[PDB]
């Protein structure tokens, strides 16, 4: 929102599946959110390196605006 992407922090470590197009992440890591609602308990995001993928939204927390 407001000329900037949405962001999230990781709450627990995760590892992607190759046939599911998920994104591997570590606890406390910050990622940009690309899609906060995809169905099935997930969200779309990208890490610092520039990889994208699906992540379980119960493993992460959406960060505040105007920060």
């Amino acid at each position: 929102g407001s000329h900037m992407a949405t962001k999230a922090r990781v709450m627990y470590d995760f590892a992607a599946e190759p046939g599911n197009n998920e994104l591997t992440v570590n606890e406390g890591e910050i990622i940009t959110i690309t899609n906060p609602d995809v169905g099935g308990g997930w969200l779309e995001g990208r890490n610092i390196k520039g990889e994208r993928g699906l992540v379980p939204t119960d493993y992460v927390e959406i960060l505040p605006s105007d920060g």
Binding site: Y12, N35, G39, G41, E44, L54, T57
Partner: peptide, 23 residues
């Protein structure tokens, strides 16, 4: 879609919660 979609429901999570939050 013309965007990324989950092939399965989300896995279970190791949240510390004997009982879930009221909020």
């Amino acid at each position: 879609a013309e965007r990324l979609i989950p092939r399965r429901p989300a896995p279970p999570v190791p949240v510390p919660a004997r009982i879930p939050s009221p909020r």
